[PDB]
Design a protein around this ligand. Structure first.
Ligand SMILES: Oc1nc(O)nc(O)n1
Ligand SMILES: Oc1nc(O)nc(O)n1
Ligand SMILES: [Ca+2]
Ligand SMILES: [Ca+2]
Ligand SMILES: [Ca+2]
Ligand SMILES: [Ca+2]
Ligand SMILES: [Cl-]
Ligand SMILES: [Cl-]
Ligand SMILES: [Cl-]
Lengths: 363, 362, 361, 363
């Protein structure tokens, strides 16, 4: 009959903590068969050797499989598990659980929150950071929009993707097959994977025309970007998982989503603009926030508003860790809550040094 | 007639003196009137941060050549306070304080003023205890007088350089038969910072003397100063007090105001400090000379009821994270990450918070 | 009454990699019901916020439970899972699987293994006499499980023990209790140290009248020469594996040990090999694994030469100590896939640590 | 014409500690006017943002200038200052001071320690890791051999070089000038600068023919390497500084140098081979060591002897920090002393995963 999306932001005590989700299931507030996606902030380093992402997915998949009486492998085929590592600064570990119920009710007036999920095929290592990833992601984004019953791309406000990275072993498998990889470096491969995935969002939504996107433009032409893509790389998968979040005229959700784009890492004005776009017009209405979701990164210029910083020179602390701490702190200072989703590395996601920011709010 | 000038100077590296040299070579700064240099240097801001000494050496070398004295004398004449750690978007820079007496008339009100005072040297067993507290309090009174400030409510930022305890000083304490406050050189810094900060609060009436004892030091976190900013040093044995405030008798074109961050994300306190310094709208933000704040990880492991990993993160020291967060918050209010944020905030603001001062053009 | 111990050192590709173990099970080399302990090196940071330890245990427990037709909870009650994080330098992630079976074969002493667990500890008990005394009780139980009655026949006592987090310190405070130290990284040292003194108490290496709360992590002249202790967020009790030789053993393996006097003491590595029957480089192929403790000396030096391990705010000293000692061992035996664990409080002298070798006879 | 070289390995308490050197000057054992080079291990992180290197050089240059009655600027023009950061593991901070003077003395008669020094021109950021750096380094190595009175490249046993790196500001400036740098990554720029400099050595010594070296080979063809090159990058200089160390028939030194090549990071055999090449035939004779100098690195394969390690995957600790800790520990365990010189990053310095190792010893 009618889609109704409920979103639960759940504090976690550890990557493997399923207790808050279990409380909501046990109380009858979540039917686990209606979960379609879980988006986590896990407390690993959010870079290459972050195993909290996999640990969190395994733990949730094992728990839900037992609850649902199905195998873990069926759970991971059915539910998107997108775990973004790195909870630096004051950023609080948590998961955001997306539930799509089928209700009898009519659609609420206007446009209300809608979510769609799509998975791509697995990518050969030589496809990462290249047009094969771009185009396959684009196809999956359009599929997820249809899942969400969003026709108009302007009603898409956040597209969250988990994507792969290159391991030493995967690079070796490509060269054994006579193939070269976009970059011979696992950490840099995260940026190419993130960037190609974000451009696929842009292509699917009509934010960028197809004839402007080529292999040579990926992670080079920062004039090209999506205003809603949020992409995250990890070792624990070989394809891209896509969650489209937007508003549909055919939805019974008591929620909406809105967004803006941070022009740089300290752009609080963009945080307030994203809150306003989600219907939050005053400080007292911030208790309607369900979550804030944003991308953060170090600007290639090595500066913010003409002021130097050491993020790209600091050999002790990787720059995506620093960018996550900063943007989370800025958002937290606006909304009074550090338990918000901030993901680092914003290649072709907002301008160079900035990133999209979305707000899911109660109506 | 007292006049204080303040120059916030971006730096390209710990040893970069070009910005300061430019202002000296143009006549805008006379090196003889420099009383203090407050630096953010881009090392890790923790134990093995050599950028603090590198920056001090580089500045002392340059200023000793320009004043014709030795760098040993320069370090005695000028207070070098180097706070390492430029995490997140925090921009390395130095802030140079110049104090001169000019022949201009009275102040149209109260204007920026600085005073300085020194304590006696502290026997190792005296650090972290009422001896240091009480002596620091006297010194603040002297510096207030030196600044020509007679209302404590006109003190807005009290820089202190305070000593610590070393092994040779540990043995000197048992060579006399008396133990020290703590059997650790790292914690002695936190006990020295806290004691000196409580001495500030005592001197200014921020807390009643009846509440301060050796047992409350670094335990009674409800006791704190709202203006003290302390840093533990290896070279001095006394306390170096620099009072910054507003005096009715000053020719400065600058004022100082302050507030207290109740926690690491308290942007409300940042705006209050700005308003206390005469910046009442986003349009007037260009009048900022610098913002000076303290950051620290809350002992509870939480901010506004939300857990964070600062105290559990074995890869990144928690003081580095606290500095990144507070810098980011202030920068998002003022639009400029080139502000001074230091760590180590015992009895400086509440647990998990810290004082925040703003120096602004009139 | 006759037990035979088999030990498999298995390279891993990630913390959750069970494929090498599954291969040994599917080939019939390991009956999974006979597994009694797994000792891993997992590739997290080996400090407080290392979740690779828990990830590895969870993955092994899930796999074994499915293979055995029992619950994960029953598996973790039956099998010791001790995951030591930190694979710094060239140290190679792997697991060591201990299998023990009853056999009927009929001189001399051969490898014996025993396992015991303690009760869970309250945060305010870590690093204090309650942990020492409960560990000591469990060590004696593990010795009986190993059928070792003479403490001189115990060559390595491997323990996993808890640590403090900020959240657990707050729990303690809310209950009106003070913890032994408020620094979460230093809490690992107190848990390791109290656990190691519990070994020394149980084995008679130190008398009880010499152990008190005030000695724990202060009197470095108190130590066990066989204790090897490892802390992690993933458990709230202590798990013990006693490894030694017994006359009631039909194993084709033996264990020997020595003590490294400092982090570069290759002579001690060669003495541990010789104690395990490996008399020359030409016999190194009989090594099953080498197991060692490493640490920064409290003096900040090695043979009078200063180092920065205790002063380095970017890299904790147990990470550096593990890289160093693994490198030294690897350069002697030609193989970096050996077990090295950092933090050797009351485990060998200040700056050193026990080192054991399991070898084919 | 006889040159006498003396070498003093001096423990340090901090990067700025000159007290050990001053003691030797004040006792008359060192004439400061005869210092030609100082090779240091300084206790910063050895990567991009290591300011202990420049702090040590500034401190040493200021001390020597006041001792010699000349300007700091003139001290740095006359004395090579090569500060290698990173004192990980048990590696002990120290400096090695090379004193060289002409002497009226008789034959050796064997070959004895010889040292030469040369400096290149400053490089533009866009010249680093490219043939401009290779070729200018090669010219300087030839000049330094001549200064050392070595005409037979087989009598060269160690060629120590300090070279530049790229920072974010230098990369961005290059972009504003319309110029592309060899790599857009500050940490990786160190590898390209070390590697080009090392191929400069191989070209100069005839270890590799010029026709095999091109931009495309640099940090790509690991079959190309020098067996005596030791290169070290730093933020604190814009040129390359070269110290050639070998033995000469025209030397009156009481010291000799020998070398070998570590095949991998745990090759203690090569440590013993280098000792033997320096005349140290047993443990009894290790009291004749003046210093041991070695290059260390992570192998591109991510393994040692077929065994995986995480050096290339660890986003928390850069691989050159790990490699230095490992190789210093191996050497210390052979010679019983961790106060030896180990530099990380051995691109075209020994095979992939290994590096040269030299021993300076009393005869
Ligand atoms: O990753 C990176 N990119 C740019 O443009 N500059 C530096 O220094 N690092
Ligand atoms: O300063 C320095 N040290 C080391 O070990 N390697 C480089 O490239 N630079
Ligand atoms: Ca962006
Ligand atoms: Ca405070
Ligand atoms: Ca020990
Ligand atoms: Ca090499
Ligand atoms: Cl001014
Ligand atoms: Cl940070
Ligand atoms: Cl505090």
């Amino acid at each position: 009959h009618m889609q109704k999306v409920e979103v639960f932001r759940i504090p976690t005590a550890s990557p493997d903590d399923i207790s808050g989700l279990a409380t909501l299931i046990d109380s009858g507030k979540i039917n686990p068969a209606e979960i379609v996606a879980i988006l986590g902030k896990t407390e690993g380093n959010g870079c290459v050797n972050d195993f909290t992402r996999g640990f969190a997915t395994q733990s949730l998949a094992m728990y839900l499989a037992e609850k649902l009486g199905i195998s873990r492998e069926e759970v991971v085929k059915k539910v998107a598990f997108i775990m973004s590592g790195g909870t630096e600064g004051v950023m609080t570990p948590h998961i955001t659980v997306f539930v799509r119920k089928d209700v009898a009710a009519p659609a609420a007036p206007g446009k209300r929150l809608a979510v769609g999920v799509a998975f791509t095929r697995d990518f050969l290592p030589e496809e990462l950071g290249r047009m094969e990833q771009v185009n396959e992601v684009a196809r999956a984004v359009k599929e997820a929009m249809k899942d969400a019953q969003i026709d108009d791309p302007r009603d898409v406000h956040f597209v969250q993707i988990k994507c792969p990275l290159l391991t030493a072993e995967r690079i070796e498998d490509a060269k054994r097959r006579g193939k070269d990889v976009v970059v011979n470096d696992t950490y840099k491969s995260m940026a190419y994977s993130r960037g190609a995935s974000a451009l696929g969002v842009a292509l699917a939504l009509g934010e960028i025309s197809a004839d402007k996107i080529s292999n040579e433009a990926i992670c080079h032409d920062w004039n090209l970007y999506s205003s809603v893509a949020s992409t995250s790389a990890g070792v624990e998968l070989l394809n891209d998982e896509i969650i489209v979040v937007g508003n549909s005229t055919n939805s019974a959700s008591d929620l909406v989503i809105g967004h803006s784009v941070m022009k740089d890492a300290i752009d609080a004005d963009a945080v307030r603009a994203a809150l306003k776009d989600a219907g939050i017009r005053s400080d007292d209405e911030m208790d309607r926030i369900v979550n804030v979701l944003a991308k953060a990164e170090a600007a290639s210029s090595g500066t913010v508003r003409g002021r130097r910083n050491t993020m790209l020179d600091d050999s002790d602390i990787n720059h995506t860790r620093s960018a996550r701490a900063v943007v989370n702190a800025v958002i937290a200072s606006v909304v009074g809550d550090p338990m918000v989703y901030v993901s680092g590395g914003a290649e072709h996601q907002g301008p160079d040094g900035g990133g999209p920011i979305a707000v899911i709010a109660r109506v």
